[PDB]
Each structure stands twice: as structure tokens, then as C-alpha cells.
Amino acid sequence: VMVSPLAVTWWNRNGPTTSTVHYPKVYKTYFEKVERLKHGTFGPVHFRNQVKIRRRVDINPGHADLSAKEAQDVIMEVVFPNEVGARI
């Protein structure tokens, strides 16, 4: 059906409340980011010439050294155990 934006706001103030405890666990990466940021410590700012080199860097503070296939297999085992198939 077609609904107005107001409905969304209505839900945000009158919708049915539900427990939210798995969200920090499920969205573990984002909460890891925020927790890491909050505990960081800053230092002095140095004004000097910066030389930046273009390089291939890995952006994943948390990863278990899995490729697409292994990651898919583990995800299927955890989330969709009955549909994993022949893989062990």
C-alpha cells in the first residue's frame, strides 16, 4: 500500500515496542567502531608536509581470514543450517 512519511513517525512514537538486545551483537562491527572511537586518546596536531602514497590497505579491523566461499559456508551453517547442503 501507499503511505505517507507521517506513518513512519507515528510508528516511532506509538508503534509496538520490542526488546532490542541482539542488535549490538548482530551489528557487531558498527558498535566495535564506536567503542573503539570512544576509548581512543588524541595527541598534539603537527603542522608539517604530508607525503601520501597510494597503497592497497585492508579496511576490516575484525575479520577471520575467510574468503567469499568460506565466509558463505560459515554464514550458511550459522544462519541457514538446514540449507547448508553437502559441505562439512
Binding site: 543450517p81 538446514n82 540449507e83 547448508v84 547442503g85 553437502a86 562439512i88
Partner: protein, 222 residues
């Protein structure tokens, strides 16, 4: 041999066997010994399953819950998902190779095999192939020879005798046809068909007009 399989079996058995054999990319008109083996396998497994239920308490019941759940006669995906579901719900670890059926009274996957050769040789072959100790094995013979793990016959004597008689009568019918000696079972060799992609017909004609000026056919330019 084909017509005998079609006419001397229930339509469901032949349909399931044909669909399963097609599912591997093989033409049924070519392979018949494998077709006969798989249809006999389905018949024996269905008899091993049909007419056995489980009552409320959990004892034997012969004419509701079905004591035997079939795995053969299904796509790889369906069979694998049922194997995984049974392994997860009951607790028995699933095997690396697809079993044949599952019993809930014993809560275990049982293999079924029907072969012309002696029980001992095929029993050893299947045991060393599956390499499984928690899955029951049952091997029958066309001549009535039949044995299972530790000589443990899950089915009641009457059912086993009925299945042996069914196997013997089908063997007698194939012998009457005269191709019993030239059947000798078969095994899945996993034959790989060479990939072919040929340019013929109108396309070829187009290919003959898409070359530099000094050429007249794709073969010459190649």
C-alpha cells in the same frame, strides 16, 4: 529391457528414476542397466519403507507416523536438506555421502543395496566407500542372500522374505526376457561429455561475411 522396466514397475518408480537419471545430464535411451538398477533400488527401498508405521508409544505398527523416511529419488538439494534437517533434529551426525533412508525407531541412517553379486563383496565395497560406522548397512542378493550390520535385521522376518521374493520374481522375469545374463548391474562412472559449440546454419553464413575483404570463409581466416 527398457519396456520391461516401464511395464514391470509402478509408474511412480519409473517416473522418479527417469527424472533422477535425467537430472545428471544423461539420456535414458542410452543407459538402461543403470536405469534398471536405480528402478530396482527404488522399488526395494519403497518396500523397505511401505507398510511400517510408529504408534503413539513408539513401537512397531503394520497395516500415521512413517517409520522409514526415504532419501533416494530426489534432487541433490532436497536430499541434502532432509539429511541436514534429520541430523540437526535427532542428533546423529550426517555422513559425507548421501545415505538411502532413515529410521526413527533406531534414529539412524540405513543404507540399502540390491545387487546380483554376492552380499559379502558389495558389503565390503560399500563399507569401505562410505567409511561410516554410525550408519546401518543392508545388502540383499538376487538369489536371496542378504545381510546387514552385525547380522542385525531391522525389518521383521516377514517383510524381509517378501522383499526377497519380490527381488527373485523380478530377476526371474528379466531372465525370461533373456537379458538377465547381460545385465550384470552397473556403476556410476561420472562420464564427462565434451563441451561442443558449433557455428552452423544462418549464423555460419553471417560468419562468412564478417571477415576482411580477401577471405571467403571463417575456416580460411582462422
Amino acid at each position: 529391457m527398457e519396456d520391461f522396466v516401464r511395464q514391470c514397475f509402478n509408474p511412480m518408480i519409473v517416473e522418479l528414476a527417469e527424472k533422477a537419471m535425467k537430472e545428471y545430464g544423461e539420456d535414458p535411451k542410452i543407459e538402461t542397466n543403470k536405469f534398471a538398477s536405480i528402478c530396482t533400488h527404488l522399488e526395494v527401498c519403497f518396500m523397505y519403507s511401505d507398510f511400517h508405521f510408529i504408534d503413539e508409544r513408539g513401537e512397531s505398527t503394520i497395516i500415521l507416523k512413517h517409520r522409514f523416511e526415504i532419501i533416494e529419488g530426489r534432487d541433490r538439494t532436497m536430499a541434502w536438506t532432509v539429511v541436514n534437517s534429520i541430523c540437526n533434529t535427532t542428533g546423529v551426525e550426517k555422513p559425507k555421502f548421501l545415505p538411502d533412508l532413515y529410521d526413527y525407531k533406531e534414529n539412524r541412517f540405513i543404507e540399502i543395496g540390491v545387487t546380483r553379486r554376492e552380499v559379502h563383496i558389495y558389503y565390503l565395497e560399500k563399507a569401505n566407500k562410505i567409511k561410516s560406522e554410525k550408519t546401518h548397512i543392508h545388502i540383499f542378493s538376487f538369489t536371496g542372500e542378504e545381510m546387514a550390520t552385525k547380522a542385525d535385521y531391522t525389518l521383521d522376518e516377514e517383510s524381509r522374505a517378501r522383499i526377497k521374493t519380490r527381488l527373485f520374481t523380478i530377476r526371474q522375469e528379466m531372465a525370461s526376457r533373456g537379458l538377465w545374463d547381460s545385465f550384470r548391474q552397473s556403476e556410476r562412472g561420472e562420464e564427462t561429455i565434451e563441451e561442443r559449440f558449433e557455428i552452423t546454419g544462418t549464423m555460419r553464413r553471417l560468419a562468412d561475411q564478417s571477415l576482411p575483404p580477401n577471405f571467403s570463409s571463417l575456416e580460411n581466416f582462422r
